[PDB]
């Protein structure tokens, strides 16, 4: 169905993406404040490329139908200009970041793995569809209830070319460097296997429950030193992950998980896991405890 936009009446702000800006709306016809409240991301700046990169955006989410991937609704268009707006379901709990900085170790180590086993079946499905993420962190997963979490932004995400298995990204914008693979670091290649590596990171995020000065931005400067500013972090950050720095082991984070971590965190690219295998492993952890 088709979203007009003279009915969708503004409610709140609930946050921004790299480029787009994402709020809570009301899809109104009848005007009597009971129609159905969705999610828009619009554009925040409306660039040259960055409309073509947004259309790009919609119809990879469109083509997405999975438990664990944020629904598309719609689209809605708009003048001569053919300014976009993506229309999504509201997932009310938010992003899983902030949900598990809120309750943090009320959510036990069952419901963690629960969150990891639906990401990794999220991810495996990209996958499938030849779609390179690029940014998974606990910022873009979001929870639709106690039991259940999306990937939420595609912002970022990039088709594979057919004869290759990597995209190479040839002039980057902001980057999550914190989250990236050593060869998105030294030659901005991104596969399926650099998207595994971030999983590693998210793991560790999940575990971590979120502490300020334990967020890997936080460890991993501590590690290079405070001291090292701008493109001298990206290099002192290639050679610590070179010489086999890595985040280190979450507090009372048990074995088998941490274990799962570095072997994600692996600089031999061919030698990190599946998202297949991940899904299994993890699985099977769970039926080991409950
Ligand atoms: O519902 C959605 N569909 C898509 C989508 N995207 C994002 C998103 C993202 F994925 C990446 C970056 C930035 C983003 F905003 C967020 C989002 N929902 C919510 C965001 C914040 C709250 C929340 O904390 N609240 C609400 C009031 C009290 C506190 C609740 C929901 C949705």
Redesign the pocket.
């Known amino acids: 169905t088709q979203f007009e936009e003279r009915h969708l009446k503004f409610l709140?702000q609930?946050?921004?993406?790299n480029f787009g800006s994402?709020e809570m709306c009301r899809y109104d016809p009848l005007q009597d404040n009971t129609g159905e409240v969705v999610?828009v991301k619009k554009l925040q700046h409306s660039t040259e490329e960055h409309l073509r990169d947004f259309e790009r955006e919609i119809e990879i989410l469109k083509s997405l139908q999975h438990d664990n991937i944020?629904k598309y609704k719609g689209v809605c268009y708009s003048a001569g200009r053919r300014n976009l707006k993506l229309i999504?379901?509201?997932?009310?709990?938010?992003?899983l970041r902030?949900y598990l900085q809120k309750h943090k170790e009320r959510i036990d180590h069952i419901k963690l793995l629960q969150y990891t086993s639906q990401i990794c079946k999220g991810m495996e499905y990209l996958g499938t569809k030849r779609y390179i993420h690029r940014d998974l962190a606990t910022?873009?997963i979001?929870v639709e209830n106690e039991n259940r979490v999306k990937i939420?932004?595609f912002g970022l995400t990039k088709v594979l070319p057919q004869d290759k298995e990597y995209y190479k990204v040839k002039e980057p914008g902001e980057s999550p460097i914190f989250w990236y693979a050593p060869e998105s670091l030294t030659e901005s290649k991104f596969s399926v296997a650099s998207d595994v590596w971030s999983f590693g990171v998210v793991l560790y995020e999940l575990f971590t429950y979120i502490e300020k000065s334990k967020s890997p931005p936080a460890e991993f400067m501590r590690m290079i030193g405070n001291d090292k500013q701008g493109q001298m972090i990206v290099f002192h950050l290639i050679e610590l992950l070179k010489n086999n720095g890595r985040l280190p082991r979450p507090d009372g984070c048990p074995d088998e998980i941490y274990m799962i971590m570095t072997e994600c965190w692996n600089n031999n690219v061919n030698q990190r896991p599946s998202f297949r295998d991940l899904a299994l492993r993890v699985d099977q952890i769970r039926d080991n405890m409950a």
Do not use: C, F, T
């Open positions: 709140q609930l946050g921004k993406g994402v999610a944020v999504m379901e509201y997932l009310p709990y938010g992003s902030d910022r873009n979001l939420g932004d």
